[PDB]
Amino acid sequence: QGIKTVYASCRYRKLNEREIISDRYTWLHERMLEDEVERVLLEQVPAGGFDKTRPGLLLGPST
Amino acid sequence: PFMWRQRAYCAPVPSAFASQQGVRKPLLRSNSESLSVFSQIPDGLLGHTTSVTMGNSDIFFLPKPSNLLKIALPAFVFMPNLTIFTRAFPFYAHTSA
Amino acid sequence: KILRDRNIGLFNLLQHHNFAGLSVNNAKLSDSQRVMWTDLVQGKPDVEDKLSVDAREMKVDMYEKLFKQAADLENPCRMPGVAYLRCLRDTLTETQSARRSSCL
Amino acid sequence: SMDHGMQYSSIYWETSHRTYLPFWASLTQKFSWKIMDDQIRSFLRLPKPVTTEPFVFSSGSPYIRRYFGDADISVPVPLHAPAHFAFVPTGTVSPWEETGMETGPQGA
Amino acid sequence: SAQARIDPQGAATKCVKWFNEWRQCAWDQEKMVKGYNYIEDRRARKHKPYIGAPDLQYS
Amino acid sequence: VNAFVVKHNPDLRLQFVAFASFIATHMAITKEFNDMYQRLVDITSLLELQA
Amino acid sequence: AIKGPSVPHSILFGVGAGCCAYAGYYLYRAMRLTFFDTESVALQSRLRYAEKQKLFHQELDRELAAGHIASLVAEYDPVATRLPFQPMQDRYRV
Amino acid sequence: DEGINLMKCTKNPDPSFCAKEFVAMRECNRPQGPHLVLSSSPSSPPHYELRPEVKHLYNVDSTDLGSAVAPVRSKEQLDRVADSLKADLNLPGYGHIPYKWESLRPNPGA
Amino acid sequence: ARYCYRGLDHPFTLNEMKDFLFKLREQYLVNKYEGIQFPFVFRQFNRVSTPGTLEVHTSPALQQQPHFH
Amino acid sequence: NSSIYDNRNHEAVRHPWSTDARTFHPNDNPEADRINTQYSNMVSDSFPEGGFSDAPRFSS
Amino acid sequence: NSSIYDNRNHEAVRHPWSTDARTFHPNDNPEADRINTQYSNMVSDSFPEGGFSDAPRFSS
Ligand SMILES: CCCCCCCCCCCCCCCCCC(=O)OC[C@H](COP(=O)([O-])OCC(O)COP(=O)([O-])OC[C@@H](COC(=O)CCCCCCCCCCCCCCCCC)OC(=O)CCCCCCCCCCCCCCCCC)OC(=O)CCCCCCCCCCCCCCCCC
Ligand SMILES: CCCCCCCCCCCCCCCCCC(=O)OC[C@H](COP(=O)([O-])OCC(O)COP(=O)([O-])OC[C@@H](COC(=O)CCCCCCCCCCCCCCCCC)OC(=O)CCCCCCCCCCCCCCCCC)OC(=O)CCCCCCCCCCCCCCCCC
Ligand SMILES: CCCCCCCCCCCCCCCCCC(=O)OC[C@H](COP(=O)([O-])OCC(O)COP(=O)([O-])OC[C@@H](COC(=O)CCCCCCCCCCCCCCCCC)OC(=O)CCCCCCCCCCCCCCCCC)OC(=O)CCCCCCCCCCCCCCCCC
Numbered sequence A: 001q002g003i004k005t006v007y008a009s010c011r012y013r014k015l016n017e018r019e020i021i022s023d024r025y026t027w028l029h030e031r032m033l034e035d036e037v038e039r040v041l042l043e044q045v046p047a048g049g050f051d052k053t054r055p056g057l058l059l060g061p062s063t
Numbered sequence B: 001p002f003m004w005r006q007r008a009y010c011a012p013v014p015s016a017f018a019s020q021q022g023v024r025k026p027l028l029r030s031n032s033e034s035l036s037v038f039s040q041i042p043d044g045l046l047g048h049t050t051s052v053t054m055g056n057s058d059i060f061f062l063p064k065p066s067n068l069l070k071i072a073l074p075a076f077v078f079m080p081n082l083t084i085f086t087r088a089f090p091f092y093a094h095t096s097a
Numbered sequence C: 001k002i003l004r005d006r007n008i009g010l011f012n013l014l015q016h017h018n019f020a021g022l023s024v025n026n027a028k029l030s031d032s033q034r035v036m037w038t039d040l041v042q043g044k045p046d047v048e049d050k051l052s053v054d055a056r057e058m059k060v061d062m063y064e065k066l067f068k069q070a071a072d073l074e075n076p077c078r079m080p081g082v083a084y085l086r087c088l089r090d091t092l093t094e095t096q097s098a099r100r101s102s103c104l
Numbered sequence D: 001s002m003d004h005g006m007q008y009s010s011i012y013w014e015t016s017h018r019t020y021l022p023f024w025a026s027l028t029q030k031f032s033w034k035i036m037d038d039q040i041r042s043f044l045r046l047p048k049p050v051t052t053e054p055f056v057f058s059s060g061s062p063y064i065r066r067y068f069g070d071a072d073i074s075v076p077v078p079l080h081a082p083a084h085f086a087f088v089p090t091g092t093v094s095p096w097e098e099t100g101m102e103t104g105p106q107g108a
Numbered sequence E: 001s002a003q004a005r006i007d008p009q010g011a012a013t014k015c016v017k018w019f020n021e022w023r024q025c026a027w028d029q030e031k032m033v034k035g036y037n038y039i040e041d042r043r044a045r046k047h048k049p050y051i052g053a054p055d056l057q058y059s
Numbered sequence F: 001v002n003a004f005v006v007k008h009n010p011d012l013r014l015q016f017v018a019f020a021s022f023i024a025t026h027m028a029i030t031k032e033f034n035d036m037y038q039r040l041v042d043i044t045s046l047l048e049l050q051a
Numbered sequence G: 001a002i003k004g005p006s007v008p009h010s011i012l013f014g015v016g017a018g019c020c021a022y023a024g025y026y027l028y029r030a031m032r033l034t035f036f037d038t039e040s041v042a043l044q045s046r047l048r049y050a051e052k053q054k055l056f057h058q059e060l061d062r063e064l065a066a067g068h069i070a071s072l073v074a075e076y077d078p079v080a081t082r083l084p085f086q087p088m089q090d091r092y093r094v
Numbered sequence H: 001d002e003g004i005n006l007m008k009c010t011k012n013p014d015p016s017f018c019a020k021e022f023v024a025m026r027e028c029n030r031p032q033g034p035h036l037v038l039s040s041s042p043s044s045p046p047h048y049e050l051r052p053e054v055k056h057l058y059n060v061d062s063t064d065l066g067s068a069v070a071p072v073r074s075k076e077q078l079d080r081v082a083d084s085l086k087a088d089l090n091l092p093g094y095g096h097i098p099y100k101w102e103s104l105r106p107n108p109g110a
Numbered sequence I: 001a002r003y004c005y006r007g008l009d010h011p012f013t014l015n016e017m018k019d020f021l022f023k024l025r026e027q028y029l030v031n032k033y034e035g036i037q038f039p040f041v042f043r044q045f046n047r048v049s050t051p052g053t054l055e056v057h058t059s060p061a062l063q064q065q066p067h068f069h
Numbered sequence J, K: 001n002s003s004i005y006d007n008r009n010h011e012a013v014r015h016p017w018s019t020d021a022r023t024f025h026p027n028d029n030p031e032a033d034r035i036n037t038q039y040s041n042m043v044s045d046s047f048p049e050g051g052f053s054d055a056p057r058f059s060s
């Protein structure tokens, strides 16, 4: 049991390292996809950007 | 997400309706966070509290004065004798002597 | 007086929690969020052929998350919106020209 | 009229209920191996937990750890000021008004 | 059924259990969609209380 | 071990003194570690109170 | 007190015994953690899992509360902000 | 450079498990530029910093989001934090012991 | 013991959640009000602090609620 | 009010308007045979079918 | 309400109309020197000079 436990300790250490790095790579993958989507979206912004002063849609009178 | 005025557990806290408050605390919080333990409190010492051990305290000592006694005493049989009639044990174990 | 006070309080609360409605009158928005919301309100949500299929999936997931947080089950437009985005998920591996006929 | 209250119920020990405490129990004291383990890990350069890193990769939105005087005691705090959205028209509802009494489509 | 239109607090007292179960199912689905798992430790020395007892296997 | 002990503590009174000093040192070091862990636990309790 | 058989010498002896006992404890735990532990790794993994779970539940609750507040945009009337005999402001999202 | 450094690090990893490399790559790959960066210092501890032009997207009073390394264990810091929390709570009743096991020792048990 | 060593992601039912919050409330009250005791928190101790001139009066009768008939 | 951890338990709820304080009493000791076990007859044990008598008529 | 043989003691009096429930608190621990011992300064220890804040404005 002691031999098995020594081997298992080594294996578990390596596995913990691999698991952490794998989860972080998955995180990075998702964030890079989000960045690609944002890069495509910024092309649809009109020239000069948005008029942040006014409402985009004016949906009623102001009398 | 269907009955908002009737489901108060899934509603924001009254500090959220108030419009007034390095990193700041969040402005919006639900009452459904009451159903979680480690929502607001931290998870510190979460897996290390079942590791604080204390030993037992029983002492197995009792003086044995046999000079006081001169008669034998009865004693239990704890297990059946398998060193004798081993082959027949399943066949006679159900009987009474 | 009571209505004025109540509605100013609502406006200040919504400004505090950074809300945006059908009248896009919020300056603190990200340009990407604003484009997405204006697509959902005014334009046509659609995935571009420039993107890779994974990024198309991500865009559709973003649309669905945003729209489901915005519209509740009592909302009438929820079912049509979810159906259209489900059709986009069905037709990710396609061009816009072929996707229009099916999602129109 | 709540603080410094009087004894309201009696205190007692039922006959022959056990106590499980020996006579040296007052000299007994507790101990945890956690401090020693931390020192040994730091000295031998053993694998650290990710709670030593303030950034949080366990979600898509940005979180930063806030520490209470020690790396063992932390809470993640979100950084985004989240934008919220409502696919709702304004001024279409007056809940204080009873609508079953008014004549019209909204009332029906 | 509990008439939450007229007794909302009384009805929420009855229905928050199903809200809690939905809250659990949400995470169980997210963790099945996004593969989230953990390193399970080796089996304990006294996993079985008695040698003749069966150790019913659980997923 | 018995040789090393009797060489330095040949008499009963000295043996008792050494035993008591050993006990006190053990208790003191345990108290140091316990104080550290107690400070951590106190912080967690204070955060529970804050909640 | 340094060498001779004396009460200070015995006190020093007991102190040394205590420190050697704790050195032995240090050795025991060092060898255990270096060669005889998987519980730390398993618990670390489980705690990372718990963090993910926590943040998921947090975000979900926040979304639900946000939907509750979004249900009030229908009640919001920006015309009531108007002052009598004055024009309406685009500040309140016409 | 960020991609190459990340690839090199993840095969011979740091006790940090390459977290700074990961976040650096994530912030470089943004279109308009990094929102979050690591401040360059003569001071010993580095800090996480937020750009000003994206400060309105984050719930922060300032740009300093704190140190990029966790605190070091210290009795004094723990005492300080506990005292601050006690002062903020202001609860009369903390430390009150209504019954103590009768003993010559001041703290029986602990 | 249920989460980290048995593998249960949801260890506490609604009852256990209520018990946890009950104990949290009791801790808060015990630290807020000095000397609080049984009727408000499950706790009994003998060495109590009394004013010095302790008056003893009868409780008022229970409030008459309106009822039909 | 219902909870035993409320001081005004089994007391009528207080409103801004004047309201009759005679309370609905649930069936705590029902008979053994409750021949109609439909929802129609069961709901009367916990709520009044016509609603509560605490409604306002606002002057403004 | 004032009497200890009342259950709602030190609680505001209930009226048909809505009224602020913050109560007038008499001076229970007055200072030793009360330089003005005229009725003007004494009455403030048991009543408010401007009257109580529980008055109605009836809609009808
Ligand atoms: C009818 C049936 C017949 C059939 C039998 C069937 C049964 C068969 C199965 C067997 C039974 C199993 C049943 C299940 C067991 C589970 C129940 C259980 O164990 O716990 C229950 C029960 C529950 O207690 P608890 O509240 O739960 O607390 C549990 C604690 O863990 C433990 O409690 P504690 O730790 O608090 O109590 C220990 C106690 C007692 O501790 C001890 O006694 C330790 C043992 C030492 C014994 C040897 C010393 C003898 C000395 C004798 C000399 C006296 C002078 C001579 C005078 C002669 C003239 C009379 O401590 C003290 O009182 C203080 C003493 C401190 C000093 C002791 C150490 C120094 C020893 C040297 C003395 C020097 C003094 C110097 C003073 C300083 C001066 C500078 O446990 C106990 O109470 C333990 C003590 C019980 C003692 C019983 C008293 C009767 C003993 C005689 C038994 C019969 C004798 C038979 C003949 C043989 C003798 C002649
Ligand atoms: C009136 C009489 C006068 C009295 C005088 C008293 C004052 C004089 C000083 C004596 C004071 C008594 C000290 C008692 C021990 C400390 C107190 C205590 O027990 O606390 C509980 C505490 C329990 O630890 P825990 O982790 O919290 O929980 C334990 C559970 O078992 C954890 O559960 P688990 O699932 O993790 O299981 C893990 C377990 C797993 O264990 C196993 O798997 C099997 C264990 C090994 C079995 C053997 C297999 C063969 C391989 C090993 C080879 C060993 C033999 C060498 C063979 C050579 C050929 C290869 O690991 C162990 O527990 C190993 C324990 C360490 C055993 C090895 C240490 C050396 C033993 C010899 C010491 C003799 C002292 C004599 C004192 C004189 C008394 C008159 O004990 C310890 O901290 C471990 C002891 C570490 C060593 C301390 C040594 C320094 C302190 C004593 C000073 C004197 C030593 C002088 C050196 C002598 C040369 C050897
Ligand atoms: C006739 C028999 C002989 C009578 C004498 C027996 C007693 C000898 C001891 C006397 C000295 C006691 C100390 C007094 C100073 C004040 C302290 C104190 O009071 O606290 C102890 C205790 C109160 O505890 P407390 O209120 O919590 O105070 C703080 C703690 O106690 C203390 O703080 P802590 O909790 O932090 O300390 C914990 C720890 C600290 O201490 C320790 O850890 C170690 C202690 C054990 C030391 C071991 C010995 C050292 C050995 C070293 C040498 C080894 C090698 C050589 C020897 C090898 C062995 C062969 O352990 C202890 O302190 C245990 C204390 C043991 C108490 C005495 C237990 C015996 C109870 C009375 C038995 C009566 C027998 C029947 C009488 C029949 C007569 C008709 O009070 C008593 O023990 C009362 C003793 C009264 C003696 C009564 C004598 C009978 C007289 C007849 C009267 C008739 C009316 C009686 C009713 C029924 C009649 C039919």
Ligand SMILES: CCCCCCCC/C=C/CCCCCCCC(=O)OC[C@H](COP(=O)(O)OCCN)OC(=O)CCCCCCC/C=C/CCCCCCCC
Pocket (backbone or CB within 6 Å): B054, B055, D024, D027, D029, D031, F020, F023, F024, F026, G025, H105
């Ligand atoms: C308060 C000041 C104390 C000053 C010293 C005065 C003498 C008091 C002595 C009382 C205890 C003497 C026991 C001797 C054995 C001690 C061995 C020991 O300490 O090992 C530790 C060990 C516990 O280890 P763990 O907590 O599981 O883990 C530790 C890992 N760090 O200690 C114990 O178990 C203590 C309890 C067992 C001993 C009890 C023996 C019965 C007591 C009778 C003897 C007491 C005599 C002392 C009284 C004074 C007059 C002689």
Ligand SMILES: CCCCCCCCCCCCO[C@@H]1O[C@H](CO)[C@@H](O[C@H]2O[C@H](CO)[C@@H](O)[C@H](O)[C@H]2O)[C@H](O)[C@H]1O
Pocket (backbone or CB within 6 Å): A001, A002, A005, E042, E043, E044, E045, G024, G025, G027, G028, G031, G032, G036
């Ligand atoms: C001054 C001299 C000091 C000498 C120091 C001596 C060091 C002795 C250290 C032995 C520690 C072994 O510790 C113990 O070993 C066994 C296997 O061997 C481990 O393994 C055991 O339990 C775990 C699960 O609980 C599993 O691996 C498995 O079920 C079982 O084999 C234990 O988890 C561990 O608690």
